[PDB]
Amino acid sequence: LVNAGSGSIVDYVKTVLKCIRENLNKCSCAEKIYSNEVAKVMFRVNVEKANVEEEVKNSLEYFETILNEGRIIVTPAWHVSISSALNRGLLVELELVNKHKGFVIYAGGDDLLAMLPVDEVLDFIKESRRAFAGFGTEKLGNMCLENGFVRINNAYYPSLPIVGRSYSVIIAHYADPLFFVINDSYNLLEEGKEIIRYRVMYNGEYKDAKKDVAIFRYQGLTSVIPLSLKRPIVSSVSDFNEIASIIDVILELKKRIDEGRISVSLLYDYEKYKHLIVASDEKYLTEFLVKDWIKRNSLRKHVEFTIDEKLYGVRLTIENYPIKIPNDLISNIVYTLRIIYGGEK
RNA sequence: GUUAAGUCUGGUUUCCCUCCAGGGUAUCUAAGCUUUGAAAAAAA
DSSP: OGGGOOSTHHHHHTTTTTOSSSSOOTTTSGGGSHHHHHHHHTTSOOSSOOOOSSHHHHHHHHHHHHHHTTSOOOOHHHHHHHHHHHHHHHHHHHHHHHHTTOOOSBOOSSSOBOOOOGGGHHHHHHHHHHHHHOOOSSOOSSSOOOSSEEEETTEEEEOOSSOOOOEEEEOOOTTSOHHHHHHHHHHHHHHHHHHEEEEEEEBTEEEEEOSOEEEEEOSSOOEEEESOOBSSSOSSSGGGGGTTHHHHHHHHHHHHHHTTSBOSTHHHHHHHHHHHHHHOOSHHHHHHHHHHHHHTTBSSTTOOOOOOGGGSSOBEEEOSOOOOOOSBHHHHHHHHHHHHHHTTO
16 A cells, blocks of 8 residues: 555555554544644645545545455456556467467467467466566567566556466377367366465465466376465565576476486486485485486586575475375476476477 | 442423404496387277
């Protein structure tokens, strides 16, 4: 609320907030902050009544409505703004998907159903998930791409930075019946946005965020990659660079796998190292374990691929569903690469 | 007093190894291949 105003109003309201446990209660703090109001009505006078008698009360009980029964009271303008953002994101999403070799089967902005080639999914998702919030380095069709904003050549338009957005990818043979492919493309995402929970950073303590999962699936595998690892998604301009970072690691590893630096056996060897890295509840110990697992099957004995440490303790909870999802992030990265390399033979 | 005659014996005992060191270090698998080819919808 307060970070949404500009001017002296930022100090006007930032006192009427949390005004029940202030040692001041509702409608009692009414003329307890009155100063900033009355000390301003005698600043530029043109309206007949400088006497308030109602203006502090309605505003304070307005905020009391929005917070006691805590929501943001929806107005038509709210709806129109988010819908316009949905459409702008829709068209930039089209721009992204045909920036790849994709074929848009449907794109509602808020949603999407495309058909890309297997080798262009990751950069797509990473772009898409960031683009959905507004992030990346290219003038996409003819509009700019800021941090939380889209600029149509001079005009900054809002976007959906806070709005989490899940994904699903099914590596399908061309001869598979499209019925099953579409149906489990839908079901995977629908039931995985519910079942999947993952250790999320929040104020230092660790909760279990639910959505924002990019699910992958081969003929028998499955994989989950969180996309935000933080709640809320963004509150600072820097936080944007954290969006869809795990898949970015998957990119910077897939590059070095086939560039002739790290073997593919990195993905066979891992099952040897997985139990210790899972059971390791300490940063530097896991650092050394993963570093050894990289070194032991490196093609050049100088590769320095630093997996970040936040990827080390994040677990994945999967309750009451018969799928087999690994409950640790590095296993999911390995399985993601396994799935993608499976659809290349 | 005189003479005359020499005879016996010809290496014994003890100690015969004691103590420490009884393996140390490096390498502990590496690189490949991780499925392929036939069968996907059959007659009553």
